[model samples]
Target chain A: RSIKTRAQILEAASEIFASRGYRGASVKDVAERVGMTKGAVYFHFPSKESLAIAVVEEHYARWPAAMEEIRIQGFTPLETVEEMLHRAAQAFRDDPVMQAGARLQSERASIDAELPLPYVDWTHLLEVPLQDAREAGQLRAGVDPAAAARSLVAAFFGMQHVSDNLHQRADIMERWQELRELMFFALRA
Target chain B: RSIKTRAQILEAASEIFASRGYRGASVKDVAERVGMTKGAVYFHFPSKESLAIAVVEEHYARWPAAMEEIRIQGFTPLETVEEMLHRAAQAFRDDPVMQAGARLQSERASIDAELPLPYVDWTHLLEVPLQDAREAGQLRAGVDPAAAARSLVAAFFGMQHVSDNLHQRADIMERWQELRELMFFALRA
Candidate 1:
């Protein structure tokens, strides 16, 4: 067998971990999927926990670019967050690594962390626009920007979770479309 | 050995299943938790799938009563849903069976079902009040009641997931309160 580099193993790990959440998936299964030796796999990952974390690391490494795209689009405060969510839905639909990232993030309790969980990071990211929107007079008076930000983030993930169950999130874009309609009305000044 | 009965097994099942998702948990683990013999557990419930289905049924049966309580409260349709969600958050925080049901429902792919899923029922239940509110000028024009209902249901679960991860759902009520405030601003006329 050819030598399996770290990148190669991570590629295989993402697919396995995404399809089977951390608890249900195994390093052995990941090895088999990659055609790598068990010893070789362990040498790279040390533990399924590490591999899972690395996979998450790889998945999250892409977020900055995504954030940049939102910056590039330079839409209004409201549109910026909506576009970010739209991009996320498309990524989840098309990318297995993202799906696995999501699956791993949901069951994050399986491993403790040195980094903040992605969910928390997303809340932080979404909050910026919500806060900006409120200050810009786009939100109705008496609205709570931080609270709306939290709800939007929560609604995004929850809708994805529901769409995952209903359509494996295949139609997540449509779901997001529906969420935007409800959220726009809620926040409109 | 204490005589293991159906109710006792279900009780333990709820606890084990809630903490560990369906595929991650086992009949063996569940039986051992309750000091139940494998045969004692199997005799009452033949498989993990059936046991999970039963656990979900038990959790859902409790929902109708929750709905009725809100019905008697006679709040505005909007407030009724808000109150119903508030009650659910409390139950999710305090009730083990509800936790088990939430776990099982989220990881539904782990167990197969031949019946309508719980999400469908919640969506249907929440839609009515949302639709009525739209009719009564409680909702902003152009808002979709069914979509908002879906969003609220998703937001409820999503908010709980975030709170659970952030604080082990210790602050789920606070999370719900925040969600209600933001959602009210989103939907109000």
Candidate 2:
């Protein structure tokens, strides 16, 4: 019961924080939405900042597992890269929580760093495929795997930055196809 | 005098917002940092949201100007791409204000739509080099210019995200070189 209530609070808080931003949201707003008293909400999370951090931590924990599931499929380095992008785009589209969490994390950097949310260092995941690509000669000769990996990751996020905007546009899928092809051309041998 | 004060406020606010985030910051904090009262700050800008929008607009204004100056240079399409990457990396290092603004802008979607800032579409700026590259036959035939452009921009921002991490021990410039080389390989005819 406690865990369920905590999860409920987080869900409500995530929506509030993602929508209203950290500073703009109030504890009373979250408590009312969750059908709980402000004191009960504080019993789970002493402050709004603590609640926001818990939300981030919970979200961050899920990603590595998802990535691991993808890895267990025995995908080649190039295929892994493709899958990561496809999955990320799909995740952003299908999972409102993730979309909100990502936006919150990015926005919070502009507001406060002390908010308890664990910052996921995403580059480590990309480096795995990059190292394999280098060994396989899929990348150009003498390409620094870490550097290439980081660039590819950056480009991946950048593509998301644009595609996320175009999601409501009629041409979003076509846009993604073009972006995928461009990424392949840039990274693959 | 009004223009100068406004600029000063923008500069100070950019630093604070970029470091602390929009929610983490308050008008009082900005006003105090500027050595003015909250009323004096409000005299120039009505609210914090408006101030953030101004910071972003100011950034977009400068970004295109710098990009345009590079565009008019005698460099070939390929060279222009390389130069732009190099300049962008340097800009990220040299200009703290831009770095903060870029980081903050990345999180803009977290804020509500009704917020009072002018929206600058960054896609237009990205398209310039992409279109030029396509025209010069620097990109592969049949490549979608807009999608390719979006990927390049995403990659640039992603690189910044990774590089900005304090825990990462890698040299940023070296990472920039690898990223540049990867893009060059990917896009070059």
By DockQ, the best candidate is: 1
lDDT of 2 at A171: 40
Per-residue lDDT of A52-150 in model 2, one digit per residue for the tens? 777776655566666677779987777787787677667666654555566666655554446443233556766777788888888656666676556
Worst 10 residues of 2 chain B by lDDT: B112-121
* Candidate 2 chain A, run of 10 with poorest lDDT: A111-120
What is the docking quality class of candidate 1?
Answer: medium
iRMSD values, candidates in order = 1.8, 3.9
**Which parts of model 1 have CA positions greater than 4 angstroms off?**
A1-9, A19-44, A107-116, B1-44, B107-116
Q: DockQ, per-model, please?
A: 0.57, 0.45
The top-ranked prediction according to lDDT is 1
RMSD of each: 4.6, 5.0
Candidate 2: residue A145 lDDT (0-100):
66
Write model 1 residue lDDT over B30-76, tens digit each, in one string. Answer: 88987879988888778878888888888877776777778787888
Model 1, A1-189: lDDT tens per residue? 334488788888888877877777888888898887899899887888888888887776776677677778778887787788888888889887889888887666546654337676777777888888888998778777877778888878888988887888887888788777777666778
The models' CA-based lDDT, in order, is 0.79, 0.67
